Amino acid sequence: PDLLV
Amino acid sequence: PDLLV
Amino acid sequence: EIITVTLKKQNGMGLSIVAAKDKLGIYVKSVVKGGAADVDGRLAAGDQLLSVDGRSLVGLSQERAAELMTRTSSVVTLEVAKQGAI
Amino acid sequence: PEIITVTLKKQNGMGLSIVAAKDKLGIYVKSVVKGGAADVDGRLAAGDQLLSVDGRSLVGLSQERAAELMTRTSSVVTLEVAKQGAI
């Protein structure tokens, strides 16, 4: 699980 | 390389 | 070890483009994983980008197309020919 | 060929893929997005720990909470970074 910022 | 838009 | 980095945010559709040939055409070389075009799911490698916000992308270089596709607002409208090689 | 009209809202940001890991949680750079603001700046790299955003600590919080704080920001954001935070 990863996010883009 | 790449040309990114 | 501990540095201070200040960043100015930037825009992008998440598309790698190439120009190819009676006139030039702008094609999707690659769709960037996780980018706006990838999350939208409609664009794919091989598609031709016919225009940006009503302005034609035919008969111009990669760099000129990039200049036009980056000088726009947060939301951009593309006309696309699915698998542009006819 | 099939001719369709695709409208996209560009992803506006720093160009950083983040992950939360542990002891308190910590926010780490999983990947630096090619061509993004962090890549053009050249200082950030995968494995670095983002210690804070504009004076607000990024320690002890989830990926989503860090993303809420890092996107809430104005066009220009200031990060405190621990180079290769896996120390």
Author numbering:
A (entry chain D): 118 to 122
B (entry chain C): 100 to 104
C (entry chain B): 2 to 22, 27 to 91
D (entry chain A): 1 to 22, 27 to 91
The authors write:
The C-terminus of the severe acute respiratory syndrome coronavirus 2 (SARS-CoV-2) protein E contains a PBM (PDZ-binding motif) targeting PDZ (PSD-95/Dlg/ZO-1) domains, which is identical to the PBM of SARS-CoV. Targeting multiple cellular PDZ (PSD-95/Dlg/ZO-1)-containing proteins through short linear PDZ-binding motifs (PBMs) is a common strategy used by viruses to facilitate their viral replication and dissemination to new hosts. We solved three crystal structures of complexes between human LNX2, MLLT4, and MPP5 PDZs and SARS-CoV-2 E PBM highlighting its binding preferences for several cellular targets.
MLLT4 is an adapter protein linking nectin to the actin cytoskeleton, essential for the formation of adherent junctions and the regulation of cell adhesion. The swapped dimer comprises an intermolecular interaction between the two PDZ domains through the β1/β6 pair, and several pairs of inter-domain H-bonds between the fragments Lys 1014–Gly 1017 of each chain. The E PBM binds to the PDZ in a conventional manner as an antiparallel extension of the β2 strand by inserting into a binding groove formed by the β2 strand, the α2 helix, and the “GLGF” motif. The C-terminal carboxylate of Val at position 0 of the PBM forms three hydrogen bonds with the amide protons of Met 1018, Gly 1019, and Leu 1020 of the “GLGF” loop of MLLT4-PDZ.
